[PDB]
């Protein structure tokens, strides 16, 4: 365990209410945030989606990426399933950072894709850790899980750093 | 200056594209963002809306707060006029924190209000002054409904010229 749950309150949204849970790195301070869709309890695999903060597309409209409609969508889907979970990862650009990241478009903003423009700012393709999401689920009683994603190797990955994945599902987008 | 430049972008959005520049606390290393849409040179003062970032309603759909709704509506504004700013400052909850501001729902979610153990607001906007200059502005039109914000945003060094109604 690498993080606290240190408070939660209702978070009214147009889907309905949601029980927002409020999470501390116990070693750095750092927030993150799970929203919870109606009764998680029972020992149905809980569906859940796991989403890496994206300040651009999650909340400045960035058509520049998909990631505020991924963000969207998934509310959407755990909201049609009456029961689910959304873990808002809190590791900007896949962790290298949002200044990280502008200055990955502007190399971007030349040619060079997302793969070198991070070897370059002297990062590597993925440098987030998932372990987090797991103790996150781990702190809301979660085990198995049944997660909302199009990538296969992220379901290879996110099992890797000790979810319970049981089962797998595609993203409306 | 309590800031630094560090990077811009093309950020493209449904309004048209929007130079985003990203800056660095020179104490802290907190990073605060500004988008700037159209030409902002000109001795014209300059069309702006200072957002302090806030999470649940920005990017989570919160309606228990319109920060979301007024973020969208400063965005369009800007857009109609087809030069302006927005300074996404981000000091989340009135720079207490989102924790602060979860723990703080939860007991709304009781019985206090939004002033009860830290102040009313803890903000400090010079840094917002601080992008401002960086980003070479002076004379500042601003986008509030609120006009004591202007009076603590010009108080901060902003030489906000006019308010200007944020519709939503
Ligand atoms: N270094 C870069 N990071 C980016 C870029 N565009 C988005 N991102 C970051 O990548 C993260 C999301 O992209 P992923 O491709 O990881 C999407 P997710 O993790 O949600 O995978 P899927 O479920 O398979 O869709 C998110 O934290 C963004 O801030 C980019 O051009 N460069
Ligand atoms: N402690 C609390 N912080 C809040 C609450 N509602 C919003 N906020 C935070 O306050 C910040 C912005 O809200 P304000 O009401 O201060 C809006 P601003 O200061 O930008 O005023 P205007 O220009 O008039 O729009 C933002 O960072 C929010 O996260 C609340 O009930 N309690
Ligand atoms: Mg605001
Ligand atoms: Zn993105
Ligand atoms: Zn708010």
Redesign the pocket.
Same mark, same amino acid.
Do not use: D, V
């Given at each position: 365990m690498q993080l606290k749950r240190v408070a939660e309150a209702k978070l009214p949204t147009p889907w309905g209410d949601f029980l927002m849970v409020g999470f501390e790195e116990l070693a750095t301070g750092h927030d993150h945030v799970a929203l919870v869709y109606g009764d998680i309890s029972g020992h149905t695999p809980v569906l859940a989606r796991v989403?890496? %903060?994206?300040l651009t597309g999650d909340a400045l409209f960035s058509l520049r990426?998909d990631?505020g409609f991924?963000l969207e969508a998934a509310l959407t889907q755990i909201a049609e399933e009456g029961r689910g979970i959304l873990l808002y990862h809190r &590791? %900007?650009?896949?962790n290298?950072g949002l200044l990280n990241?502008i200055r *990955?478009?502007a190399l &971007?903003d030349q040619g060079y894709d /997302?793969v070198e *423009? @991070?070897h370059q700012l002297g990062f590597a393709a993925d440098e987030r850790d998932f372990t987090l999401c797991a103790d996150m689920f781990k702190l809301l009683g979660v085990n198995e899980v049944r997660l909302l /994603? @199009? @990538?296969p190797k992220?379901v290879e990955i996110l099992t890797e750093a000790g979810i319970n994945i049981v089962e797998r599902v595609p993203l409306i987008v």
């Open positions: 989403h890496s %903060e994206c990426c990631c991924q &590791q %900007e650009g896949r290298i990241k *990955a478009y &971007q /997302t *423009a @991070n /994603t @199009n @990538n992220k």
